[PDB]
Subunit: 261 residues, 4 copies
Amino acid sequence: GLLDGKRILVSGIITDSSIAFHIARVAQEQGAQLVLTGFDRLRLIQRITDRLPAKAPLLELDVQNEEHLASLAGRVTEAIGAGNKLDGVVHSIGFMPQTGMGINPFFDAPYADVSKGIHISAYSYASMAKALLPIMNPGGSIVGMDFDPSRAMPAYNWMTVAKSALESVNRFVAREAGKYGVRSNLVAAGPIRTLAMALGEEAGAQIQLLEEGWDQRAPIGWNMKDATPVAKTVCALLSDWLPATTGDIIYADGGAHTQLL
Amino acid sequence: GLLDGKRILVSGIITDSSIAFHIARVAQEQGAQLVLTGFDRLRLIQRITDRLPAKAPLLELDVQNEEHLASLAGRVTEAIGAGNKLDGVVHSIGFMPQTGMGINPFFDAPYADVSKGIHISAYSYASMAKALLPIMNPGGSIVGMDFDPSRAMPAYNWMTVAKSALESVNRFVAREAGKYGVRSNLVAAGPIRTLLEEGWDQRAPIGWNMKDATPVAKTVCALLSDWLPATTGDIIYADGGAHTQLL
Amino acid sequence: GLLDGKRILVSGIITDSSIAFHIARVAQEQGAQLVLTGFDRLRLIQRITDRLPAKAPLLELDVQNEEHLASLAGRVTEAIGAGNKLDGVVHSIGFMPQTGMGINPFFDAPYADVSKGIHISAYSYASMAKALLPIMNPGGSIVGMDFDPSRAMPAYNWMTVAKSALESVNRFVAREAGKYGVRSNLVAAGPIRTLAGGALGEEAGAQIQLLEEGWDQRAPIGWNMKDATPVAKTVCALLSDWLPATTGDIIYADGGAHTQLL
Amino acid sequence: AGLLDGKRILVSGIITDSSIAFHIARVAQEQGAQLVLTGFDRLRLIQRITDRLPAKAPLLELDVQNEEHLASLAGRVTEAIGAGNKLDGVVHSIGFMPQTGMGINPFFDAPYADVSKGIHISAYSYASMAKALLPIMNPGGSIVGMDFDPSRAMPAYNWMTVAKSALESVNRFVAREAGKYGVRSNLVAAGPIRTIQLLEEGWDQRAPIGWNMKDATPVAKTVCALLSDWLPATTGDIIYADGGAHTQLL
Ligand SMILES: NC(=O)c1ccc[n+]([C@@H]2O[C@H](COP(=O)([O-])OP(=O)(O)OC[C@H]3O[C@@H](n4cnc5c(N)ncnc54)[C@H](O)[C@@H]3O)[C@@H](O)[C@H]2O)c1
Ligand SMILES: NC(=O)c1ccc[n+]([C@@H]2O[C@H](COP(=O)([O-])OP(=O)(O)OC[C@H]3O[C@@H](n4cnc5c(N)ncnc54)[C@H](O)[C@@H]3O)[C@@H](O)[C@H]2O)c1
Ligand SMILES: NC(=O)c1ccc[n+]([C@@H]2O[C@H](COP(=O)([O-])OP(=O)(O)OC[C@H]3O[C@@H](n4cnc5c(N)ncnc54)[C@H](O)[C@@H]3O)[C@@H](O)[C@H]2O)c1
Ligand SMILES: NC(=O)c1ccc[n+]([C@@H]2O[C@H](COP(=O)([O-])OP(=O)(O)OC[C@H]3O[C@@H](n4cnc5c(N)ncnc54)[C@H](O)[C@@H]3O)[C@@H](O)[C@H]2O)c1
Ligand SMILES: Cc1cc(=O)c(-c2ccccc2)c(C)[nH]1
Ligand SMILES: Cc1cc(=O)c(-c2ccccc2)c(C)[nH]1
Ligand SMILES: Cc1cc(=O)c(-c2ccccc2)c(C)[nH]1
Ligand SMILES: Cc1cc(=O)c(-c2ccccc2)c(C)[nH]1
C-alpha cells in the first residue's frame, strides 16, 4: 500500500469525472485514510463521494469564506481524531468565470471576475496550507493541480494567468511548509475530459487541436478520457518516494511539454 | 537618435529615481516625442517631469479607475494631435501593500491586499494595451517592467506572484498586439534604488549597479526601437546577467 | 515492495559511495531483480556489489566501447534468462577530465577532453537506450543522473555543458523509448559526498564550499550532502508505475533548491 | 549616425548571400560598422560573395577545428584593423552537423565521431572564438552567437538540438570570461530561415507578429541590437528573434 495508514485531505470533488475523485479513489486503493472537503452543493457531493471504495468524512470548504478556513483545522482534527494529524493535503480547486476563460476576448474579462478566479485558483493554495500546516506531520505533502501556463494559448486566457500565479504561490508555500518538514508541489497535467471538458464551432475546434496536439507531442501518448495517470502522480507526490522534491512541478502530461512537434 | 520621431507613452513617473523617469529621459535624448501618465499626485509629478530634457504632456491615469481607461485614448489623441498615433507604450506600474511585500509573513497577506497589488501590477498591463492598442501604429512596441519571479525569494512575497501573473498577461497581450503589428515584451531588470541586492553584483558577469537605472532605461528603448522586430510575448533581462549564473 | 518483480539494469557503481550503489540498494530493498554493469575494474566492483542486500549479475560496460554496446542486450538476456526483458534501466555514468571540470580555466580545456566527457556523460545515454530498448518491456523506465545545468557556476565548467547536452539527449531518447512504451527521465540531484576539500587548493576549496552550503540554505526542506537515499528513492519512484505519464522530463531531488533564489 | 557607427566588428559564417551572417554583415555595414570577415574552406568563393556587401571588408581564413587558425586569428585581425585598434564586436554564425545526426537518419544511428565534429563546430568553437578574440576586445564589447531554441525536442533536428543545448551552456560560461574584459556574450535564438514544412508553417501561426522564413533582416537587426550599446546589462542570455512563437502553445 503506497499510502498505507496515511491521513490525507482531498478537496475538489464535484462529479465522478473530477480529477480529485480519481486522486481520492487511488489514494483509498493505496491504503490512505481520507478527509474530504466540498464546496456549495454538499448533499450532491456526498452522493458522489459515497461511490469511493471507502467511507470518508465530508467537510464544507468554500476557499473564499474566511470562517471555513479559520475552523477547517479544528473540524479536520475532530474527523481524524484528537492526537492525529494529516500526512497529506490535495488542492484540486480551480475556477474562472466565463468572461476570463472560453470564447470571451482576453481584454473583455472585468477584473472582479479575474480576481475571483485568482482567489479560488491560486491564493487558496496558500489559504489551505496556512490552515492545515499546523495540523500536518513531518514528512507530509501538499499537492496542487496545475495546467502548464509557461506559454499562451487560445480560450484558457485568464486561467493561464491564475496558473502562472499558482506556480509562484506554490514556491512560497514550500518555504512555509519546509518549517514543518512538509513538501509542497504541483502536478501539471495534460487535458482531462472532466464533465466541463456547447462552446460553439470555433472553441469546439480549438479544444480538438489542443487535445490532438497533446497526443502527437506526448512521446508515450495522451488519453484525455483517463485520469488514473494523473491520480497516480499525485499519489507518488503524497508518498515517501519523492522526499527531496519541493516548490516544484511534476508533469503528468505524457511528456507533451518536452516536445515541440 | 534611436527613437527619432516616435510618439511614446510613458507611465509610472513619481520621483526622479523612478525607472520610468530614466526611460523618459533616455527616450527624449534619443529623439522620442513623449506623453506621460501620472497617478494621484499630479501637480507633484508635473514638478518632477519638468526636470526631463524636453516638454511632455502629463495625463492622469489610475489603472484601477475605469473612467481613466475609457477616456485615455481620446486624451492621448488630443495631446499628440488628431491623425497621429502612438509608436510605443511603457508600463512602469507596480504596487503591493506592505502585508503582501516585506517583513510581514507570506500567509498573513489578506486577499483584498493581494488583489489590489495584482490589479495594479499585472491586470493593468492588459488594461493599458486594451485602451491604447486602437491608437497604436504598425511597428509599435508595448514594454512592461518585470523582476524575475521564476524562483521564490525573501520579502518579495506576493509581488513575486503579481510578477508571475504579469509575465502570463504579457504573453496574452502579444496575441492581441500582434493583430495591430505591435510587439509586447517585459524588461526583467535587476534591483534598482528607486524609493536580496548584494549577491547581484557578484552573480552578474558584467556587474550590477543598483544606484544606476540608465542600463534598464536603455534596454526599454532598445525594445521600443526597430532593432528587435521579431521579439514579442517575451522577457528581456537587463540584470547584468545574474539570472544565468548560480554563484 | 515498490519494484516487486521488476528486472532493472543499474550502471555506474565504482564505490559504496556511488549514487548507483544507493539506487541498487533501495531497488533491491523494494523487491527489484538487478543486473549490474561495471567499467574497467570489474574485480573491484564485484567486491563492492557483494555488499548489496541481494546477489546480482555483474556485466562489463565501457560506454566508449562499441563491441560492449553491440553485445550488451545478448549478455543481459543471458543473465535474466531468455524470454525475460528489462522493466528499468539506470544510467549513473559521468566523466570529465580535470582540464574541463575543476580549477582549470574554462578556455584551457582541449576539445579532445571535452569530447570524451560529452561521450561518456551525454551521448552514452542514447547508446544505452539504443542497446537496451529492444529488450525492454512496455511500461518500462530509463532513468539518468543529472546536475541542474540551466545556469553557469564555478568549477563545473565543461561538465555543465555535458549535462546541458544530456538533458537534450533525454528528450530525444523519450521519442524513441515512447515507441516501446518506455519512459525516459533524468533525476537532477543536489550535491552528494561521493568518493569522486583541500585538494583543489584554498580558492577553489572555498568556492565548492559556498556552492554546497548554498543548497541547504536554498532548499526549503534542507539538503544533506552526506545522504544519497533521497536521490536513490526518487530514481526508484521514476522506475515504479507511480509516474506513468512523465517522459523526456527532469525530476529534481535537490531539497527544492532550484526553485529558490536565496 | 548609424546604430554601430565606428564600431570594429568581426563576422564569421558567410558561405552564400542567403547565410544569416551575410545579412548581419550587410545591416551592420548599413549601420556604420567597420567589419572583418572570417571564412571557411572555400575562401576564393567567400570573397566573391562578400564583394556583394555594401562596403569593403578584409576576409580572413578560419576553420574552427584548426588550432593554428585560432592561435593566429587575433594577430591576423590586429594586422587587418591596424595595430592599436581592437574589436568592439564578434559574431559567431557557425554551425555544422553531419547528415547522420540531422535529418531523416534515426537519432540512434548517428556515430559519436559525427556528433563530436558537430558539437566541436556548433558549440565548442563559440568558446574557442572568445578565447582567441577576447584579448583583442574593447570594454563595452559584444560577442553574439546564433541559436535555434533547443529547450524541447523536435523531428529531424536531432543531434543539432543537443549541439544547441551545449552552445547555450557554453554561452553562459563565456559570459563569465567576457565579463572580465567588460564584454557581453549572448545568443540570438532565431526562427527558421531558408539558407521542416511543419516547422516552417507552424511558426508563422503560433508567432503573434508572424514569421517570414524567406527574410533574415529581422534576425540581422536583433544581432545588431545586441552588438550596439542598447542592451548594456544583457549577458549569458538568449534573445528570441522568432516572431514570438516560443511563448505560444498554438
Ligand atoms: N480538467 C482538466 O483537463 C485539467 C487539466 C489540468 C489541470 N486541471 C486542474 O485541476 C483542478 C480540478 O479541475 P477538474 O478538471 O477536476 O475540475 P472540477 O470542476 O471537477 O473541480 C474544480 C473544483 O473546484 C471547486 N471549487 C470552486 N470554487 C471553490 C471555492 N470557492 N471553494 C472551494 N472549492 C471550490 C469546485 O467545487 C470543484 O470541486 C483545477 O485546479 C484545474 O485547473 C484540470
Ligand atoms: N525598483 C526595482 O528595483 C525594480 C526592479 C525590477 C522591476 N521593477 C518594476 O518597475 C516598475 C517601476 O517601479 P519603480 O522602481 O520605478 O518605483 P516607483 O515608485 O517609481 O514606480 C511605481 C509606479 O507605479 C505607480 N502606480 C501605483 N499604483 C498605480 C495606479 N493605481 N495607477 C497608476 N500608477 C500607479 C506609482 O505612482 C509609480 O509611478 C514596477 O512595475 C516595478 O515592479 C522595479
Ligand atoms: N555526486 C554528485 O554530487 C552528483 C550530483 C548530481 C549528479 N551526479 C551524477 O551522478 C552520476 C554518477 O556519479 P556519482 O557521483 O555517483 O560518482 P561515481 O564516480 O560513482 O560515478 C560515475 C560512474 O561512471 C562510470 N564510468 C565512467 N566512465 C565510464 C565509461 N566509459 N563507461 C561506463 N561507465 C563509465 C564510473 O566507473 C562510475 O561508476 C553522474 O552522471 C554524475 O554527473 C552526481
Ligand atoms: N537557417 C536557419 O533556419 C537557422 C535558424 C536559427 C539558427 N541558425 C544558426 O545560424 C548559424 C548559421 O547558419 P545559416 O543558416 O546562416 O547557414 P550557413 O550554412 O550559411 O552557416 C553556417 C556557417 O558555418 C561555417 N562553418 C562550418 N564549419 C566550419 C568550420 N569548421 N570552421 C569555420 N566555419 C565553419 C560555414 O562555412 C557557414 O558559413 C548556425 O549556427 C545555425 O545553427 C540557423
Ligand atoms: C485543460 C484544462 C485546464 C483547467 O485548468 C481546466 C479547469 C479550469 C477551471 C476549473 C476547473 C478546471 C479545464 C476545464 N481544462
Ligand atoms: C527589487 C525590486 C523589485 C520591485 O518590483 C520593486 C517594486 C515593487 C512595487 C512597486 C515599485 C517597485 C522594488 C522596489 N524592488
Ligand atoms: C555536484 C557534482 C556533480 C557531478 O556531476 C559530479 C560528477 C562529475 C563527473 C563524474 C562523476 C560525478 C560530482 C562529483 N559532483
Ligand atoms: C531551423 C534551422 C536550424 C539550424 O541550426 C540550421 C543549420 C544547421 C547547420 C548549419 C547551418 C544551419 C538550419 C538550416 N535550420
